[PDB]
Design a protein around this ligand. Structure first.
Ligand SMILES: N[C@H](COP(=O)(O)O)Cc1c[nH]cn1
Ligand SMILES: N[C@H](CO)Cc1c[nH]c[nH+]1
Ligand SMILES: [Zn+2]
Ligand SMILES: [Zn+2]
Ligand SMILES: [Zn+2]
Ligand SMILES: [Zn+2]
Lengths: 255, 246
């Protein structure tokens, strides 16, 4: 089945990314040469496309690095080989491959694979969400039971993205009200929500390649993921993930 | 002295790993800090007990000559929620100047250490140690910054200034607590800053940052761990960072 293949693709991407991460010349003195990450990002995409072309010939593929059909029909794989390239290039291990199958534009299978954090998160529709640490036996994920905002832990990415001068004030406001604030960034915030270690994750601009695997993992863990406008799923352009209980309050404070 | 510190961390790692694993992670309100206070006390007691170096003093749970300073669990608010960003900080101070430091985060499978004049190192999953050096980033507009949370920056003007700083740098995260500083020492980040931080929380970090070639000061530019706040950088960026915050 489809989950088994997605997990296999992540195993393969992990081999490709691990070696390249290790190979990086980490000496730096200005904004980093994104070049070797673009190389690695392209290499892993090409390899996933080649495997997909063989082993599920029918299904479409959309790639962040190379491209795919712009519309969203039938079975379609969506792949971001390295989410967190800006960490990758600095030697910061917060980066992952995101591999997701969409059925008529609805995420049905998700894998987030972060070999340099020795972690994987995955989910298939109606089958639950899971995580492994250092390849050890998988644990079923569930969101937290935190019902009050004043008791909630939030993780974000960076303050700059919250562009609108009012939305920034509103978001800064939200950080003042919650119990705990960090910014683990990118995919990590959302996986932590799914794990129930964090209660809220928010990003003001985020693409479908970056959200697709997360949407299914969050949901199968019991959580909710929507745009800032409350539209469910990965196509919103922004994402707020919560344990569900907190969702409407979070969205209300942000609007 | 260094060998002893690394040994104390090995022992603290055994105590902390088991207790982190043992935690009941179901939660619906602010977390019961109780099991972390228990673990914190347990590790401190066991370090106090560990004996060899009987002459030396010991100072978070329970500044003359040889004094050990120990925070057994930095990042207790992570520990209690199941977030693996937490560590033991073990440091030796000589007349109030850090000479030996170990940061051990077994849940991240990482350790960072330094002794005066001997350099700074890190291990990942017990694999062969690497010598650390800070980055060579000279321009603020190209710098990566990591902090803790925004609320700590209390003063309405200092907050605006800090928010400003985040707007100007190339990359902003908040990995939090000890992690930000260790990343500076690794050269993976160029600036780390916290507006309220205790000597127990900075002592191991001061030596690690400096042996890696960086600088660590208060927000008022007082060098070392006693300043009540900390800014660590690769050195090159230090004065510009302090100036923008003052
Ligand atoms: N920093 C990201 C650019 O690189 P990448 O897509 O190759 O990781 C943008 C991003 C993705 N998720 C969160 N932010
Ligand atoms: N924050 C991650 C939580 O799994 C671990 C980490 C961050 N940086 C390095 N390691
Ligand atoms: Zn990418
Ligand atoms: Zn991406
Ligand atoms: Zn502390
Ligand atoms: Zn701390």
């Amino acid at each position: 089945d489809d989950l088994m293949l997605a997990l296999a693709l992540a195993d393969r991407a992990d081999e490709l990314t691990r070696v390249r991460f290790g190979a990086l010349d980490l000496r730096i003195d200005t904004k980093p040469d994104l070049t070797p990450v673009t190389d690695a990002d392209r290499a892993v995409e090409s390899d996933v496309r080649q495997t997909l072309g063989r082993d599920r010939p029918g299904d479409g593929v959309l790639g962040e690095e190379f491209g795919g059909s712009t519309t969203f029909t039938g079975r379609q794989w969506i792949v971001d080989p390295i989410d967190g390239t800006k960490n990758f290039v600095r030697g910061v291990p917060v980066w992952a491959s995101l591999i997701a199958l969409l059925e008529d534009g609805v995420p049905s299978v998700g894998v987030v694979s972060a070999p340099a954090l020795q972690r994987r998160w995955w989910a298939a529709r109606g089958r639950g969400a899971f995580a492994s640490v250092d390849g050890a036996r998988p644990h079923r994920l569930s969101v937290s039971s935190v019902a009050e905002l004043h008791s909630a832990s939030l993780s974000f990415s960076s303050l700059s993205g919250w562009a609108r001068p009012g939305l920034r004030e509103r978001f800064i406001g939200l950080t003042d009200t919650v119990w705990r604030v960090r910014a683990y960034g990118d995919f990590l915030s959302y996986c932590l929500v799914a794990e129930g270690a964090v209660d809220i994750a928010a990003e003001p601009q985020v693409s479908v390649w970056d959200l697709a695997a997360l949407d299914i993992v969050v949901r199968e863990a019991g959580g909710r993921l929507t745009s800032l406008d409350g539209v469910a799923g990965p196509h919103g352009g922004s994402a707020v993930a919560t344990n569900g209980l907190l969702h409407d309050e979070v969205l209300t404070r942000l609007n």
